[PDB]
Amino acid sequence: GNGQGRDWKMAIKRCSNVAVGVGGKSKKFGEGNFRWAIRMANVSTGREPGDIPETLDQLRLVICDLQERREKFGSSKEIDMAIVTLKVFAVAGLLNMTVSTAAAAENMYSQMGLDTRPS
């Protein structure tokens, strides 16, 4: 629960290069995107609104719970945006791995087996 730390800002800064669209013909991820995605995920999964994931493991738990909810209740433009936004924050932010688009981050998140729930 700390979206004010300097490590948090560096994570967002890394994700500033990532595009929401599949090409160079789109927007760039902003800090508002991630705060919205995290908050929307916390409320949906019985977490406190302002709970900020510190480690990668914490974020994966949120993503797993959110994807599970999408599997049970259904998909939508909002919940898909939230899930992919967290995955971008996971790959390009915490792991610091260069991805061009959100689709690339989504693809890297799966290949590295991050979809699997930790223990």
Numbering used by the authors: 2 to 120
Give sentences copied directly from the paper behind this entry.
During the viral replication cycle, the FIV p15 matrix protein oligomerizes to form a closed matrix that underlies the lipidic envelope of the virion. In FIV, HIV or SIV, the N-terminal domain of Gag undergoes a co-translational covalent modification of the MA N-terminus with a myristoyl group. This myristoylation, together with a highly basic patch of amino acid residues located at the N-terminus of the MA, directs the Gag polyprotein to the plasma membrane (PM), mediating the association between Gag and the inner leaflet of the PM lipid bilayer, where Gag forms a hexagonal network. The structure consists of five α-helices (numbered h1 to h5 following the HIV convention), which give rise to the close packing of adjacent helices typical for retroviral matrix proteins.
To investigate which interface could be the biological dimer that we observe in vitro, we constructed a shortened form of FIV p15, p15-Δ120, which is truncated after Ser120 to remove the residues involved in interface 1. The p15-Δ120 truncated protein was stable and was still able to generate dimers in solution in MES buffer, even at a lower protein concentration (3 mg/ml). Crystals of p15-Δ120 could be grown, and data could be collected to 2.6 Å resolution. The crystal space group for p15-Δ120 is different (P21) from the full-length protein (P21212), and 2 monomers are present in the asymmetric unit. The truncation of the last 14 residues does not alter the overall conformation of the protein, as demonstrated by the RMSD of 0.5 Å between the Cα pairs in the truncated protein and the full-length protein. The assembly in the asymmetric unit of p15-Δ120 resembled the interface 2 observed with the full-length protein. However, Trp37, which was involved in the hydrophobic interaction with Pro131 in interface 1, is not free in the p15-Δ120 crystal. Instead, this conserved residue demonstrates hydrophobic interactions with a PEG fragment from the crystallization solution in both monomers of the asymmetric unit. Finally, the interface 3 observed in the full-length protein is maintained in the crystal packing of p15-Δ120 with a similar buried surface and intermolecular interactions as the full-length protein.
